[PDB]
């Protein structure tokens, strides 16, 4: 399986997942194509942000289903 | 040229290429309701040449629910013409004007944007077919009630020159391969970051320096750290060097006519959980218009079953393609109504396209968006009769939510906690929902006044408002749009020394904050008053045209503090103080260089000559620190003391001798240009740039705006008279004698001479004074100076000079803001504080909200849970704690956890102090034990207890029965 | 017992303890009663802390409450103010066949109100009053250079880790990386070039220097004026070393009175072993002054 990753400022990432990952590997493996630490990613799918302890399959993310990478920001 | 000193804060998001474009364009806004009023404002603040305001219909009674300009006393006047006279003064580098007339054929040809509102199914069509054959941008938008659509046709052939709105990314080049797909390599192993696809040209390649100034090439990232760019054996053999750098390429699209894109429609996705959403509400709005001419041109009753009946077989009959019977029920009952931050967002969203459509800047929506906020509604929904109108402002808002409602936000209380943007945004936005009309009140706080550079995009404030506190001008100006509004103002900053006007008791009667800060520390001190006191919070946040908005429930989802945001990003001393390599070092050096030279070099001499018991306060620190002191008063008021304006010359001359000659000398007589290691690659290699000593020249236009500034700033601190030419400036600075420099390889005593000396030598009448640093004056050469030396520094290491405008934006921290964002940001705010105000605790209800209006792109997520623990098989949360009462001692504390929760405390911790721990002093445990815990308290913090803090917080860390530690809530001790 | 056996059994008890730095003082203030660097710091942060600093700097405290390293080479003792555990005090005692063996070296710890999202705050305060580069990565202001110190870009294992980093690792990265026994080829692209003989000439002259740097900052002027906070840890450590001290100090006088192969550095080996002598003279005078502990 392959997955796409797309960050709020609109910069896309493929992915090879299985599965049954866990999304701690997901990170890990976001970890290594971008550099931002598991702890400071959030991972938006179908309404629902994903968090850790969790696999795959528990959020239904198959074959090209795309993920969003965003953030928080400080300014008002 | 563009006014820098009113769109400061706009260029760096726009560019000073698309803000002359927007410059020469003509709008036109047919429509004046709330979303048009929205676009409006928006489109004005933004900047666009001129903007024509054509409206037909009558203001009414239903028109004051979301239009802030109109009054009850405009019933019966045309909107665009009420309208026209204030929406003026937003922005008096636009010219705004109001048309009554037919949009006939010759009257469209003017206009480079044409936006429709509340138009008919006919005119649409023909205006959408005269637009797209005669090569004009059309934008269509329509609200029915918590529903949204946005149509872009921009024309048959649309240019946009950057995609994203993303600064480019350079990296440095390690080796390259020679051979037909030559493979590029990272310096070091550093992330290039480069997306695949992408286009790069190269610069200071040595070997192959026929790649240098190259047209870009299509790269292929082989992964992290390495990209192929093809063949490269037709150049020479790769030396060493070599910068890789991104270039944005233009794309051309085409947008299909209206007609065409209605059969075959491209919808922009607003929330990822209601994929069939679009498809259906294209349906529903596209059929409103049949039931408008089959029903005397009037829309479904509020909640009325069988208005929502007949709306539902017109949808049927009007499409073949299967449709969501319930959405289009719920779509009919509500389509009647309007409400204020629906219309705000649309807004927002629709002048960000405006803009894009000026400037051929950031991607537009391709072709159809469409929203909803359906989760404001209660479950149950409403009552028809209580949807019914009353004669009042509301009457659009009642044809949504209901009277109940109405009543529910008239008695509410809500603490918005700062006036900026968004403050002034959240602050109309809850005016013209009618929030703390009745019983309840609306409270906004502010520290800070208002400047020139933030009229670009806080509406509320005008020119002649400038030096007046922002909270009470903006309760001042949302009271004329509303004046049922009750507003509290307060001038000041939330934290820990202002909780005598923001007690437990002032938070006890609130329902909630919104919170519309620039900083972490008051955003993590909020969230902390919110936790304690239990009441929902609503966080926004923006930068350029990205925002996010995050809501916080009590017992329900985590806090705010519960996540961590990436650090910010620090220089390494090394990389700042002998090797630079980019602007942003040679900037904070610059930077702190004028910290050090202007402020910190004369704090000490300033105390001494205002304080004349300076010296014998001083004389009690600890350590070395009196001598420390008492040597840099003297250095700043006998030894570099200037008599004159030519002594600040000089010593302006050899400041600069000294940073850009003598100190480069000395680290290149540390490290010879052309060392080299032992492996091969030379020590002035990769990341480090050897530097070169400069020339003083006064022809150099650089070195003498250094001089110029460097020597008014000197005098400025000293009180000499400045002396503003730069001809006496020159003449003046080729008498300096240099001196020649070469590269190298009893303390009671001390203070008592200098004091002596000080007393003696040293003059009181003196007027020395520290410079604060202040960027958005030109006049006081502050920018002047940091430019300067920058620049200076970069060219010492042959870094690529950086103007003014990327050298303000660099090292005066200035955070990008336009006004689209801001709205469209407090309009989500709002929407999830209507749902708070409803009842809602499911996290289903509740959105955390994403946005980056540049893709454009928008998206939604549920809030998450609180994370949940167990102590001796007990659940707990965030929002648990213990509860203490009355007055005990410390003993009588711990002996009240070991007795009853079966904890042993082992540190015991009031904020940032320390109460109690297993390893303090044994005298100091034994005396702090019978001592009731106020005292404690007080002692530890040595500071006394104020009359209004009713409850103290402690975080205690807790050992089990078995020894080991547990985690357990905070404590809650009730002062008796 | 041996002297290494006392040594490690009475400076065991001293390694982590708190001291009162901060006192109450007029109108609701307080005021510092000992130097510490980052008191502007302090002040400017104010109350402010992140939720999860507390849970994490008791953390941090029961680690160094055990886990500080200890032994007859060298040692680390840190205190903390007894009301507030971000401000501390670290002592490092330099590792034995160093230039900065025994001698006394003193920083100054900050734990910001980010920690530990950010950093900690450390500076060298044994400087000689900024007249002494100790260290290639310990400049003459007191600033300390480490990867680990670092959230800029660099490399993941590299950083600094929010979850991993800890002070700990922090102080035993001091003491292995900057107190190495040739400070010269700390700084990059010198490393290569050692095993010449111009590096090792180099690498003498630099040792040379910290030698009596060493012998007049690290250890007479510790002696002479110590912190309130280590008093009597530095004069426990000095009196149960001080034949070893005299010892290694005139070890290092007789080896810079070897003959040098270039001039350049043999007349700087030669001023530099002058002022080791004319600062070991002094040092021997203040050390028979020193009274037994009990
Ligand atoms: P943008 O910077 O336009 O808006 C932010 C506004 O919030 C105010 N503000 C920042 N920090 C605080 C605190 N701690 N208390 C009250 N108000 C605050 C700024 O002054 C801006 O007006």
Redesign the pocket.
């Known amino acids: 399986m392959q997955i796409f990753v797309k960050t709020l400022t609109g910069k896309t990432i493929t992915l090879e997942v299985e599965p049954s990952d866990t999304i701690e590997n997901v990170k890990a493996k976001i970890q290594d194509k971008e550099g931002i630490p598991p702890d400071q990613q959030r991972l938006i799918f179908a309404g629902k942000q994903l968090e850790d302890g969790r696999t795959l399959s528990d959020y239904n993310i198959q074959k090209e289903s795309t993920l969003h990478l965003v953030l928080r920001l400080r ?2 | 040229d563009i006014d820098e000193s009113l769109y400061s804060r706009q260029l760096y998001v726009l560019g000073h290429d698309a803000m002359r474009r927007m410059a020469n364009s003509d709008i036109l806004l047919s429509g004046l309701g709330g979303l048009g009023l929205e676009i409006a404002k928006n489109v004005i603040l933004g900047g666009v040449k001129s903007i024509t305001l054509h409206d037909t219909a009558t203001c009414g009674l239903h028109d004051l629910s979301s239009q802030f300009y109109l009054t009850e006393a405009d019933i019966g006047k045309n909107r665009a013409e009420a309208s026209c006279a204030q929406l003026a003064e937003l922005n008096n580098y636009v010219r705004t004007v109001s048309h009554t007339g037919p949009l006939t054929e010759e009257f469209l040809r003017k206009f480079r944007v044409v936006v429709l509102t509340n138009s008919d199914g006919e005119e649409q069509q023909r205006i959408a077919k005269f637009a797209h054959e005669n090569g004009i941008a059309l934008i269509i938008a329509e609200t029915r009630g918590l529903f949204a659509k946005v149509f872009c046709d921009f024309g048959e052939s649309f240019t946009i020159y950057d995609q994203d709105g993303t600064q480019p990314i350079s990296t440095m080049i390690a080796s390259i391969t020679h051979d037909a797909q030559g493979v590029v390599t990272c310096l070091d192993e550093t992330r290039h970051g480069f997306n695949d696809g992408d286009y790069v040209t190269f610069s200071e390649v040595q070997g192959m320096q026929e790649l240098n100034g190259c047209q870009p090439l299509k790269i292929t990232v082989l992964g992290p750290y390495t990209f192929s760019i093809g063949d490269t054996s037709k150049f020479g053999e790769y030396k060493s060097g070599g910068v890789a750098t991104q270039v944005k390429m233009p794309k051309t699209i085409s947008f299909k006519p209206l007609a065409q894109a209605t059969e075959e429609p491209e919808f922009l996705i607003s929330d990822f959980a209601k994929l069939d959403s679009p498809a259906t509400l294209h349906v529903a709005f596209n059929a409103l218009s049949c039931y408008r001419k089959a029903h005397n041109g009037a829309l479904p009753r509020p909640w009325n079953e069988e208005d929502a009946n007949s709306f539902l077989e017109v949808v049927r009959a009007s499409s073949n393609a299967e449709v969501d019977e319930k959405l289009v029920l719920q779509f009919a009952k509500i389509c009647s109504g309007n409400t204020c931050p629906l219309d705000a967002a649309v807004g927002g969203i629709v002048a960000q396209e405006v803009l894009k459509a000026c400037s051929g800047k950031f991607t537009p929506i391709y072709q159809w968006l469409y929203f909803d906020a359906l989760e404001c509604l209660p479950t149950e929904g409403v009552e028809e009769a209580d949807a019914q109108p009353v004669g009042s402002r509301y009457d659009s808002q009642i044809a949504i939510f209901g009277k109940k409602f109405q009543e529910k936000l008239a008695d509410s209380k809500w603490f918005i ?7 002034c945004e959240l602050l109309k936005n809850f005016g013209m929902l009618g929030l703390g009309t009745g019983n309840g009140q609306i409270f906004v ?4 006044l208002i400047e020139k550079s ?1 009229l670009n ?2 509406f509320l404030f005008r020119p002649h408002d400038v030096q007046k506190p ?1 909270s009470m001008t903006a309760a001042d100006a949302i009271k004329r749009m509303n004046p049922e509004v009750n507003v509290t103002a307060y001038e ?4 820990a020394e202002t909780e005598k006007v923001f007690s437990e008791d002032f938070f006890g009667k609130l329902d909630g904050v919104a919170n ?4 972490v ?2 955003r993590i ?1 909020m969230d902390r008053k919110c936790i304690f006191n239990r009441i929902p919070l609503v966080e926004t946040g923006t930068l350029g045209t990205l925002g996010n908005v995050q809501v916080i429930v009590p017992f329900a989802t985590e806090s705010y503090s519960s996540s961590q945001d990436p650090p910010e990003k620090s220089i390494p001393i090394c990389t700042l103080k002998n090797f630079p390599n980019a602007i942003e070092h040679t900037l904070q050096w610059a930077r702190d260089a004028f910290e050090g030279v202007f402020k910190q070099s004369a704090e000490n001499a300033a105390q001494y000559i205002a304080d004349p018991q300076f010296t014998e306060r001083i004389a009690k620190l600890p350590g070395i620190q009196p001598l420390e002191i008492l040597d840099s008063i003297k250095k700043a008021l006998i030894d570099d003391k200037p008599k004159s304006f030519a002594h600040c010359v000089e010593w302006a001359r050899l400041y600069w001798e000294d940073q850009y000659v003598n100190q480069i000398k000395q680290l290149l007589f540390n490290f010879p240009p052309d060392q080299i290691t032992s492996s091969g690659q030379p020590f002035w290699s990769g990341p480090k740039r050897c530097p070169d000593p400069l020339v003083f020249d006064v022809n150099d236009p650089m070195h003498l705006d250094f001089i110029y500034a460097a020597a008014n700033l000197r005098a400025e601190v000293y009180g000499i008279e400045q002396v503003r030419n730069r001809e006496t400036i020159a003449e003046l600075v080729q008498k300096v004698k240099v001196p020649e420099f070469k590269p190298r390889s009893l303390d009671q005593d001390r203070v008592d001479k200098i004091i002596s000396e000080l007393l003696k030598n040293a003059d009181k009448s003196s007027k020395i004074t520290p410079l604060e640093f202040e960027k958005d004056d030109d006049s006081n050469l502050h920018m002047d100076f940091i430019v300067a030396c920058s620049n200076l520094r970069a060219a010492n290491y042959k870094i690529p000079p950086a103007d003014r405008h990327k050298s303000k934006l660099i090292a005066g921290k200035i ?1 990008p ?1 336009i006004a689209t964002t801001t709205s469209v940001l407090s309009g989500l705010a709002v929407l999830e504080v209507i749902k708070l105000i409803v009842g809602h605790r499911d996290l289903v209800k509740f959105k955390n909200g994403f946005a980056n209006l540049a893709l454009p792109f928008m998206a939604f997520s549920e809030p998450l849970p609180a994370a949940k623990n167990t102590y001796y098989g007990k659940e707990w949360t965030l929002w648990d704690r213990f509860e203490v009462t009355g007055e005990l001692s410390l003993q009588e504390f711990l002996n009240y956890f070991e007795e009853n929760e079966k904890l042993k405390i082992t540190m015991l911790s009031q904020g940032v102090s320390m109460l109690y721990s297993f390893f303090m002093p044994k005298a100091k445990c034994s005396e702090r034990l019978p001592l009731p815990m106020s005292e404690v308290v007080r002692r530890v913090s040595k500071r006394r207890l104020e009359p209004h803090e009713r409850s103290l917080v402690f975080e205690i860390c807790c050992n089990d029965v078995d020894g080991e530690d547990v985690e357990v809530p905070y404590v809650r001790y009730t002062l008796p | 017992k041996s002297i290494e056996q006392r040594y490690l059994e009475l400076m065991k008890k001293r390694q982590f303890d708190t001291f009162d730095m901060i006192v109450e003082s007029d109108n609701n203030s307080f005021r510092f009663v000992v130097s510490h660097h980052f008191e502007k710091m302090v002040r400017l942060a104010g109350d402010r802390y992140h939720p999860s600093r507390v849970k994490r700097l008791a953390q941090e405290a029961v680690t160094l409450s055990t886990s500080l390293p200890l032994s007859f080479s060298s040692s680390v003792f840190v205190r903390c103010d007894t009301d507030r555990l971000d401000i501390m005090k670290v002592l490092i005692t330099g590792p034995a066949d160093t230039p900065y063996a025994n001698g006394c070296f003193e920083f100054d710890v900050f734990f910001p109100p980010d920690y530990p999202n950010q950093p900690m705050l450390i500076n060298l305060e044994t400087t000689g009053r900024h007249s002494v580069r100790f260290n290639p990565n310990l400049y003459n202001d007191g600033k300390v250079c480490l990867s680990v110190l670092n959230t800029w870009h660099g490399r993941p294992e590299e950083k600094w880790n929010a979850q991993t980093s800890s002070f700990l690792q922090v102080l035993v990265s001091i003491q292995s990386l900057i107190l190495v026994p040739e400070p010269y080829f700390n700084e990059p692209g010198f490393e290569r070039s050692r095993g010449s003989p111009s590096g090792t000439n180099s690498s003498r002259e630099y040792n040379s220097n910290i030698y009596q740097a060493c012998v007049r900052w690290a250890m007479l002027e510790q002696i002479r004026s110590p912190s309130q906070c280590f008093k009597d840890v530095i004069h426990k450590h000095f009196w149960l070393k001080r034949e070893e001290i005299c010892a290694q100090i005139e070890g290092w006088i007789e080896e810079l009175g070897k003959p040098q192969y270039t001039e350049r550095a043999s007349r700087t080996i030669s001023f530099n072993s002058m002022v080791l002598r004319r600062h070991y003279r002094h040092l021997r005078e203040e050390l028979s002054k020193l009274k037994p502990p009990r």
């Open positions: 300014g008002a | 906690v700062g006036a900026g943007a968004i403050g706080t502010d520290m800070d933030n995009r806080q922002k000041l900053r939330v934290g519309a800060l620039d900083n520390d008051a001190y955070i803001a």
